[PDB]
Amino acid sequence: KFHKKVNSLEDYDNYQDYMVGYDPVNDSENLDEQESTQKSFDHIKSILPLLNADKRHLIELCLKYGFQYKAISKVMGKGIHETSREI
DNA sequence: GTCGTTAGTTGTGGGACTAAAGGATATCGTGAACCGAAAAATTAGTGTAACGGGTATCCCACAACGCTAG
Secondary structure, three states: HHHOOOOOOHHOOOOOHHHOOHHHHHHHHHHHHHHHHHHHHHHHHHHHOOHHHHHHHHHHHHHHOOOOHHHHHHHHOOOOHHHHHHH
């Protein structure tokens, strides 16, 4: 059904002339947004060393395994509730 | 008399057909039933308040004299 719901681009005469188009402005804007996000993350990384060591390691682990309160709690010693509160 | 050769058809197949603009479509037919897969929702479990010195910072106010005698 899906493959029979798909037409052929040849049904439109000279489809390569007026269809299947893109604007590089969109690509440049997407890359600019990516750069903005990267700059924000670099700002956060630079702020990280100013925090307490335990809270810095909590975030560092949460950024390389990922908000895994259970596995972090067993790793740390604090419970699920305490570890979530500290995060 | 018989077999290979050459030239002239004859039928058949493959390949061309300005430039500029524009550029919307509609798209049937049906057989059953059970099992497996994974994606989603529902449920079960733990909780602070002030205190001793001692010291880092903040705001907030004030001071930072002048003269006389031994």
